[PDB]
Amino acid sequence: YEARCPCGVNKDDGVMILCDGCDKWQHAVCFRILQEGDVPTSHVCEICAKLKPELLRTGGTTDETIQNLSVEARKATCLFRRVLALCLNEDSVSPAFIARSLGIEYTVARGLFNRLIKEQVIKGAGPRRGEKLVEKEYLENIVCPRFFSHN
Ligand SMILES: [Zn+2]
Ligand SMILES: [Zn+2]
């Protein structure tokens, strides 16, 4: 059993999806999948989509938004998706909590925290210094559909 995911953190968290091409697991949210019903019949990771494109013509589905990005741009997108999903299940966050939860370095977590402020997902002081409260309804009803809609 192996996790191999372009967020760069090769550890199970949340809903995991199996690539039909390499038999490694990715975080569903990294691949733009939040609801279990949006898990494809045959998931294809970003590596297999480029090594074996026939997988995509014979029933497989990749996340076309990250497939051809650079390593660094893809990692930043996937990690931000993970932090959005974390916020869906929490009342407040901080860089340190983000770092622990996602398995990443503090400085990277702080960048994700800062982007949450810009996307207006967090606002208002939490109980502890450095924490901000999640705008729960705004996240669920408005922000999340910007990133995770399948229509
Ligand atoms: Zn991931
Ligand atoms: Zn694969």
Residue numbers in the entry: 280 to 430
Show sentences the authors wrote.
In meiosis, ploidy reduction is driven by a complex series of DNA breakage and recombination events between homologous chromosomes, orchestrated by meiotic HORMA domain proteins (HORMADs). Meiotic HORMADs possess a central chromatin binding region (CBR) whose architecture varies across eukaryotic groups. Here, we determine high-resolution crystal structures of the meiotic HORMAD CBR from two diverged aquatic Holozoa, Schistosoma mansoni and Patiria miniata, which reveal tightly associated plant homeodomain (PHD) and winged helix-turn-helix (wHTH) domains. Our data reveal how meiotic HORMADs with PHD–wHTH CBRs can bind chromatin and potentially discriminate between chromatin states to drive meiotic recombination to specific chromosomal regions.
To determine these proteins’ structures and mechanisms of chromatin binding, we expressed and purified the Hop1 CBRs of two diverged aquatic Holozoa: Schistosoma mansoni (blood fluke) and P. miniata (star fish). Within the CBR, the N-terminal PHD shows two highly conserved zinc coordination sites, one with three cysteines and one histidine (S. mansoni Hop1 residues C284, C286, H306, and C309) and the second with four cysteines (S. mansoni Hop1 C298, C301, C324, and C327). Structure-similarity searches using DALI and Foldseek revealed that the S. mansoni and P. miniata Hop1 CBR wHTH domains are more structurally similar to canonical DNA binding wHTH domains than to the budding yeast Hop1 CBR, which binds DNA in a noncanonical manner. We detected DNA binding by both S. mansoni and P. miniata Hop1 CBRs (Kd = 16 μM for both). Mutation of arginine residues in each protein’s predicted DNA binding surface (R389 and R407 for S. mansoni; R463, R477, and R463 for P. miniata) to alanine resulted in a complete loss of DNA binding. Overall, these data show that in contrast to budding yeast Hop1 CBRs, S. mansoni and P. miniata Hop1 CBRs bind DNA via a canonical wHTH-DNA binding interface. We were unable to perform the same analysis with the S. mansoni Hop1 CBR because of poor solubility of the aromatic cage mutant (W304A; not shown).
